[PDB]
Amino acid sequence: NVRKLSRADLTEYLSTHYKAPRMVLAAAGGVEHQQLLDLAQKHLGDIPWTYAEDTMPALTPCRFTGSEI
Amino acid sequence: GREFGNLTRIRHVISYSLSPLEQRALPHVLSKGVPNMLRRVRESFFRVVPQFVVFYLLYTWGTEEFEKSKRKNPAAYENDK
């Protein structure tokens, strides 16, 4: 796969999965919360949130098998 | 002596298995097993059967001959008087 993956695949991956309601901005240490929130609105507030066409891929539900390799 | 720790030396073989409770015990009989039995009969027919056929012919012949031998011969009384 790595010898065959293209820029189209990378950009499609990003466009489909990297959406605001799936993200968390976390901080620990000598950080004040309201300052972090102001900076977050300034530098992260333009990330989109509208999942489009439900473009997200369909995938198989979970199952566990007793087996050996 | 012979023990599952040191029987032989092998490299680069991979195996895969399911558990018995995941799969069926008699999965495909009439679509796979029956034809297989048929070819298995085909591959051995002419190496086994003709000898027994010959035995059967010999048996029947020998029986018939023995049973003929017990019947009275007309020439034993008709020939000379």
Q: Read out DSSP for chain A?
A: -TTT--HHHHHHHHHHH--GGG------SS--HHHHHHHHHHHHTTS-----TT-SPP-PPP----EE-
Count how many Cα atoms sit within 13 Å of the Cα of residue B41 in the half-sphere of its side chain. 6
**Alpha-carbon dihedral sign for residues B37, B40, B41, B42:** positive
Give the distance from residue B18's alpha carbon to the nearest chain A alpha carbon, in angstroms: 4
- List CB contacts (< 8 A) between A68 and chain B: 15-17
Method: cryo-EM
Q: How far apart are CA A24 and CA A47, in angstroms?
A: 12
Q: How far apart are CA A8 and CA A13, in angstroms?
A: 8
Distance separating the N- and C-terminal Cα atoms of chain B: 89
In one-letter notation, the amino acid at residue B54 is V
Residue among A66, A68, A69 whose CB faces B21 most closely: A66
DSSP B1-67: ---TTSS----S----EE-GGGS-SS--IIIIIHHHHHHHHHTTHHHHHHHHHHHHHHHHHHHHHHH
Q: How far apart are CA A2 and CA B64, in angstroms?
A: 84
- The torsion angles phi and psi of A63, rounded to 5 degrees, stand at -155, 145
Tokens, residue B15: 């195996």
In one-letter notation, the amino acid at residue B41 is V
- List CB contacts (< 8 A) between A67 and chain B: 16-19, 22
CB contact under 8 Å between A67 and B21, yes or no, is: no
Is the distance from CB of B19 to CB of A66 less than 8 angstroms?
yes
Q: How far apart are CA A8 and CA A19, in angstroms?
A: 18
Q: Please indicate if any CB of chain B lies within 8 Å of the CB of A6.
A: no
Q: Please indicate if any CB of chain A lies within 8 Å of the CB of B18.
A: yes
Residues in chain A whose C lies over 2.5 Å from the next residue's N (breaks after) = none
- List CB contacts (< 8 A) between B15 and chain A: 68-69
Residue among B15, B16, B19 whose CB faces A66 most closely: B19
- List CB contacts (< 8 A) between B23 and chain A: none
In one-letter notation, the amino acid at residue B23 is Q
DSSP A21-39: GG------SS--HHHHHHH
Bridge partners of residue B18, in order along the sequence: A67
Specify the residue for token string 């979970």: A62
Is the distance from CB of A58 to CB of B15 less than 8 angstroms?
no
Among residues A36, A67, A17, which one has the least CA distance to residue B22? A67
CB contact under 8 Å between B18 and A69, yes or no, is: no
